[PDB]
């Protein structure tokens, strides 16, 4: 046990409040237990200090206590897809569901129901997608309600926090197997070993240099890889993978790519959807990830599998 | 001008707040413009950068603004006395008003009431029993009203904040003379260096080594010393000056001291008292300070003060 003022002074005097202390302080906090003004005080201790491997790990883990989590009965070859310009990984998700993986997104949310699919689905029912269609979108505020406690101070205080990361991690489906994109360089280290800490088996983070949470086109990607227990960093090019550079239509761009119409759209797409059918352990590397990804866009089968989706989202809520 | 989340962000990258920000910044505060939330976040981003001089200065700058003044006409030999076991402060002002100077000192406020004197005197009446009497007792209350503002911030948070060292460097009088007591050695060097930004001519910031908020008798005392625009940290002893060392009854412990008792009570008020006569410009040092002050409980002359302060306070206010 520990309490919001003693971990108000531990940030105070630089130092690390430990992983058990802040499961026990993050439950105080998602409970409503501790006021704004004091809550705000830790965020700001923290982000100032800087927030460690262990602070992240236990207060996710809390995250994930208070969330509702999708009970997957198949869990084979699942990808959990997060993030922080279309929808490019909500146009992936059908793409590499249809290319052999489960595939779990969070939300994007526009752009699914302006294309015919519900999205006040409840967690068994994103179960049942899943098992159905291979394809799992959960709706933020279905799956994470108790964020709305600290929503006000975070609104008021208008700076990043801990908070800013702790979503992407919190994996309602319990995905071995994560694709990541992040904010800024440094959480692809960060949070490759928060993910290896909350029991991960295999992860890719990304940060395209562009300024893009994903597998960018216009610059280099920095890819922080989780493996085997091991982290290893490094970067990759679109030419690597023979891909050329490029510098309401957002349904537009989303579907013509479906609709295997070539382009720098189709070519991002394929590029994430290779790089999330490779973590999912479908395909032996992302350059195979990306084939896969071609192949199930020329035959449409990912188109198949955004209608199948649909339909099946307007069966279940009737 | 600076907004409070642009202060807030200033502090998380550990950059200092300059002194004009810092004085746009807190009059917002003291204003009542700034949320508890956003105001908790800011002082922690504070506490854990450290606090500069300039930081300092330009929020003491603004204090005294938000302070009742008191205007004194005859500004000679003046010192103002401030601090964070008996009343010794307290006792100490009557010792240096008798030995000659002009004793402004802050609220103790318990222990004067409870000798006769009354409490809620407004600023043009601390004015009065300063030219009358040469002591100004100032209730906080009275002279700070603003600091309601961020009373319950400050209340909720727990921890020690900029706050906790501002009240000191008020100095409603005005007095260009200071003696201080701090409550960590830090605030030694850094109190006289901010005094000395706020245009103070003469300062003596002092800490007990055994924990005490004035000179002491059981330790040696750290001083820092502002004198003609320098400054200056050594430290002094009791046995320096010829004492002993020292390991409701309250105002008997006071009483007995002005009656001339002898004792370490009597010891370390003429050793604080001296001190005050000696940054007033009284007594050429802090020794010869320690005489006056030991002559003036000898001739009765203290004791005649604490009378004439009382029955000021009591005619006043009728």
Redesign the interface.
């Known amino acids: 046990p520990i309490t919001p003022?003693q971990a108000?002074?531990r940030?105070?005097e630089?130092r690390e409040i430990f992983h058990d202390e802040m499961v026990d302080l993050m439950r105080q906090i998602m409970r409503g237990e501790v006021?704004?003004?004091?809550?705000?005080?830790?965020?700001?201790?923290l982000?100032?200090?800087k927030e460690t491997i262990g602070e992240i790990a236990g207060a996710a883990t809390v995250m994930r206590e208070f969330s509702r989590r999708v009970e997957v009965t198949d869990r084979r070859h699942m990808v959990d897809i997060v993030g922080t310009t279309f929808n490019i990984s909500t146009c992936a998700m059908f793409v590499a569901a249809a290319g052999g993986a489960k595939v779990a997104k969070h939300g994007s949310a526009d752009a699914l129901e302006a294309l015919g699919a519900v999205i006040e689905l409840q967690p068994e029912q994103v179960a049942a997608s899943l098992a159905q269609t291979g394809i799992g979108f959960m709706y933020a505020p279905v799956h994470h309600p108790a964020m709305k406690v600290v929503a006000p101070?975070r609104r008021?205080?208008?700076?990043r926090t801990i908070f800013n990361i702790l979503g992407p991690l919190t994996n309602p489906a319990g995905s071995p197997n994560i694709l990541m994109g992040v904010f800024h360089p440094d959480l692809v280290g960060i949070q490759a070993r928060v993910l290896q800490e909350l029991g991960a088996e295999r992860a890719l983070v990304v940060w395209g240099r562009d300024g893009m949470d994903e597998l960018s086109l216009g610059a280099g990607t920095l890819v922080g890889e989780l493996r085997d227990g091991q982290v290893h960093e490094y970067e990759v090019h679109p030419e690597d993978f023979g891909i050329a550079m490029s510098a309401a239509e957002s349904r537009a761009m989303l579907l013509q790519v479906l609709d295997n119409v070539p382009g720098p759209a189709l070519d991002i797409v394929a590029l994430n959807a290779g790089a999330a059918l490779y973590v999912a352990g479908v395909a032996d590397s992302i350059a195979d990830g990306i084939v896969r990804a071609r192949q199930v866009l020329a035959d449409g089968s990912a188109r198949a599998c955004l209608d199948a989706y649909v339909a099946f989202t307007q069966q279940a809520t009737a």
């Open positions: 003022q108000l002074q940030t105070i630089h006021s704004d003004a004091m809550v705000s005080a830790i965020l700001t201790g982000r100032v200090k101070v008021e205080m208008g700076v």
